[PDB]
Chains A and B, each alone.
With several copies, the nearest count.
Chain A
Amino acid sequence: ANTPDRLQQASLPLLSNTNCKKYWGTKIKDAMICAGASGVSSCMGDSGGPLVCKKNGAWTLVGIVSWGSSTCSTSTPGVYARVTALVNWVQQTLAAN
Chain B
Amino acid sequence: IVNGEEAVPGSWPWQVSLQDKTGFHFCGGSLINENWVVTAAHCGVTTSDVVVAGEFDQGSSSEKIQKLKIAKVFKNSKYNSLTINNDITLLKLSTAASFSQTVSAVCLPSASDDFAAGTTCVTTGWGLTRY
Contact = CB atoms under 8 A, between A and B. Distances in A.
A46 B28 contact: yes
Interface string A61-95: 11111110001101000111101111111110110
B120 interface: yes
B29 A49 contact: yes
Which secondary structure dominates chain B's binding surface? loop
Contacts of A50: 12, 14-15, 28, 30, 106, 123-124
A10 B15 CA distance: 14
Contact of B124 (A49, A60, A81): A49
B43 interface: yes
Categorize the interface residue count of chain A. Answer: 35 or more
A84 B112 contact: yes
Contacts of B87: 31-32, 64, 66-67, 81
B122 A7 contact: no
A22 interface: no
B99 interface: no
Nearest to B119: A14
Interface residues of B, number: 71
Interface in B89-107: 89-90, 92, 106-107
A87 B106 CA distance: 13
Interface in A36-72: 39-53, 55, 58-67, 71-72
11 contacts: A7-B6, A11-B121, A16-B117, A31-B85, A45-B26, A47-B43, A49-B123, A50-B30, A50-B123, A55-B115, A71-B131
Given A31-B85, A55-B107, 4 more contacts: A31-B87, A48-B39, A51-B123, A85-B111
Interface of B: 1-7, 9, 12, 14-15, 18, 25-30, 32-33, 36, 38-40, 42-43, 55-60, 72, 74, 76, 78, 80, 83-90, 92, 106-113, 115-131
Interface of A: 1-16, 19, 27, 29-32, 35, 39-53, 55, 58-67, 71-72, 74, 78-81, 83-91, 93-94, 97
